[PDB]
């Protein structure tokens, strides 16, 4: 409603770097808000794509940002009569970024890994990896829970059970309030998907450069399954956390599986032990139900509510014809321990191929009315197809069905304006939470400052 669309703030990265593919707010140890920006095709030392991370100080004029430097060199370790190998070319460093406390976690989902032992090998596979940084102290750490040293032959003997070689860990990421990093790995267990959790403190204390394979005893991974409903389900394409079991001691996980059960898609709510509490099923096959998930209490009852995006949902129109527009689903959490019912509200896009619901960002209480609000992205929506971000205000019965405000892309065609979103942080310290929007196609980030209503 009250975001300012006249005086925006633009940040920019190198051309072709996909600057803005992912973004997050970052508060330093002093509470000064900056913007961490992932650029997963930034050139590395060998003039080759490796990705990169940028830490943008808040300036009303925006502009260029300094780099958050990481080690981009391939590693080789000959230990235990084996050969460990990391491959960082086209790893996509910055495809996901997330900030917790004074720590930044940037992941390279397509970092490859291999283990040679004489004429056998583990196969060169995208295990993924995440880089951790404490900018003020310069501390660096890494986390790659899906690396293994098992040779290819063993997986064939076990019919490829517990096969984490293609995790792409860090594809999605989130940190609990307690400081536990939770990584989505949609390729884990031979593309069923998995979650990897470990405390940030233990990741730092147990990491040393060069080891490549080390034990993080406090870590916790989800489990493989023989249920065909999960085969090729990409469990972990999107992840989020919230409070859904009435126990404020436990943190619950929200996972997206957009191809679950033969591309029907699903979203599951689990406890910290990966025991399923709820399952939300897709409405239409190939709609990619679960591409994005968002957790926020919208109706002001203190209970976290759920939002699921299905960017490829095909709306039914006249003369028995379908139209891909996208759809977002709102599930209000019922009082006490009860199952989430049917969707409390359906929001459906209007522009053909707009992909309404590609990203859903909690905004906090934008207009300061006591109810939390959300922003939904249609990266190829709007009458021009250039991209649109729509704001929906919370209310006692959930969300308003019509948007209070529509932000049209200020970038040219193909920018993918809205592919990434982040809100609920007051960057200019004016008392109103603001919104940062990524447009990796134009290698830029736009900041919308909220103003008095």
């Amino acid at each position: 409603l009250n975001l300012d669309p006249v005086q925006l703030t633009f940040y920019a990265g190198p051309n072709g770097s996909q600057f803005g593919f992912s973004l997050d707010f970052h508060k330093d140890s002093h509470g000064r808000v900056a913007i961490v920006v992932g650029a997963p095709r930034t050139l590395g030392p060998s003039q080759e794509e490796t990705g990169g991370v940028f830490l943008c100080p808040w300036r009303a004029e925006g502009g260029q940002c300094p780099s958050l430097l990481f080690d981009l060199r391939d590693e080789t370790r000959n230990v235990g009569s084996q050969t460990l190998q990391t491959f960082k070319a086209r790893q996509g460093l910055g495809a996901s970024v997330v900030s917790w406390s004074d720590v930044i976690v940037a992941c390279a989902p397509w970092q490859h890994w291999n283990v040679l032992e004489k004429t056998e090998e583990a196969e060169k596979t995208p295990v993924g990896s995440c880089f951790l940084a404490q900018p003020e102290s310069g501390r660096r750490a890494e986390y790659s829970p899906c690396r293994g040293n098992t040779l290819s032959r063993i997986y064939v003997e076990n019919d490829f059970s517990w096969d984490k070689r293609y995790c792409e860990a860090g594809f999605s990421s989130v940190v609990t309030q307690a400081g536990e990093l939770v990584l989505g790995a949609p390729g884990g267990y031979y593309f069923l998907g998995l979650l990897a959790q470990a405390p940030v403190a233990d990741i730092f204390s147990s990491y040393r450069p060069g080891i490549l394979l080390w034990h993080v005893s406090s870590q916790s991974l989800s489990f493989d399954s023989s249920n065909p409903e999960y085969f090729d389900g990409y469990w972990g394409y999107s992840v989020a956390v919230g409070e859904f079991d009435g126990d404020l001691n436990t943190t619950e996980y929200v996972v997206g599986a957009p191809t679950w059960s033969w591309t029907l898609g699903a979203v599951e709510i689990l406890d910290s032990y990966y025991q399923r509490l709820h399952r939300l099923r897709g409405e239409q096959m190939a709609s990619y139900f679960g591409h994005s998930v968002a957790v926020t209490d919208v109706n002001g009852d203190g209970r976290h509510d759920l939002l699921v995006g299905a960017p490829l949902y095909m709306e039914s129109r006249a003369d028995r014809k379908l139209a891909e527009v996208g759809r977002v689903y709102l599930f209000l959490q019922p009082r006490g321990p009860h199952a989430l019912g049917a969707p409390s509200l359906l929001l459906t896009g209007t522009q053909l191929y707009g992909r309404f619901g590609s990203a859903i960002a909690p905004l906090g209480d934008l207009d300061r009315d006591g109810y939390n609000d959300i922003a939904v992205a249609a990266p190829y929506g709007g009458p021009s197809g250039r991209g649109q971000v729509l704001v929906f205000l919370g209310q006692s019965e959930g969300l308003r069905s019509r948007p209070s405000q529509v932000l049209d892309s200020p970038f040219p065609t193909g920018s993918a304006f809205g592919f990434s979103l982040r809100g609920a942080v007051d960057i200019d310290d004016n008392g109103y939470p603001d919104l940062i929007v990524g447009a990796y196609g134009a290698n830029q980030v736009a900041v919308y400052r909220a103003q008095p209503v």
Epitope: N78, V79, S81, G210, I211, L213, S217
Partner: antibody
Framework: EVQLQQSGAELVKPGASVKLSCTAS????????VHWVKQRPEQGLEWIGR????????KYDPKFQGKATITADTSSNTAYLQLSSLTSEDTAVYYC????????????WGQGTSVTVSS | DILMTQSPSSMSVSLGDTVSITCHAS??????IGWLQQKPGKSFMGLIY???NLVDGVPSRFSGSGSGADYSLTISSLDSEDFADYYC?????????FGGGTKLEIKR
Amino acid sequence: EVQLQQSGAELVKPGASVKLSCTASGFNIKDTYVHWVKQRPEQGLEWIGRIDPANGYTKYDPKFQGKATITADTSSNTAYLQLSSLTSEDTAVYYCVRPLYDYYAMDYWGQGTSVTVSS
Amino acid sequence: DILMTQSPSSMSVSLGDTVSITCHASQGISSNIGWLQQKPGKSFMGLIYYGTNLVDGVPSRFSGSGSGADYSLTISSLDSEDFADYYCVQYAQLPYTFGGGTKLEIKR
């Protein structure tokens, strides 16, 4: 706290067999590699072999091929070392080892099990 | 197998001295080495892993260095509890092989 608790001292005759136990405490034996090391005053420290308790796969120094047999039981959270065809040269102190962080290191050691072979 | 030559066999030193124990491999092992301590009559306690990394709890006066086939364990300002046996071990190749050992003794 990680602790490796090994079985007590053994006093056996030549030609017999003995089976040493190394029980995990404060952690699951399945977490890491588990090694066995032999020690003597003159010959020093010799690496016998390792086991991955999660799957049972093992590695040995070929010097102990036939004499030593390393096994593990995740049920009882214990790793084992069986020595067959015992000789005075098998009289030694035997340790079980597991790494701290590095997958391949040798950082945590049990208290050692004493074996004496004599008629 | 990889041969680990450790030196010296023993040394007579005093409290506060800065002593170094060397370990030489028969081939390059690229810091895939660990250092161990065995106090008199007691079990083993790991000090260093992967060349230079201190095991959790080990005092900072211990420090490992070196590369290729030559490594060192340096103790700054010896404490009374530092008079013990010390060993190196390579884990670059199977089978793991240990150094001969070094005994620190009190000079008088």
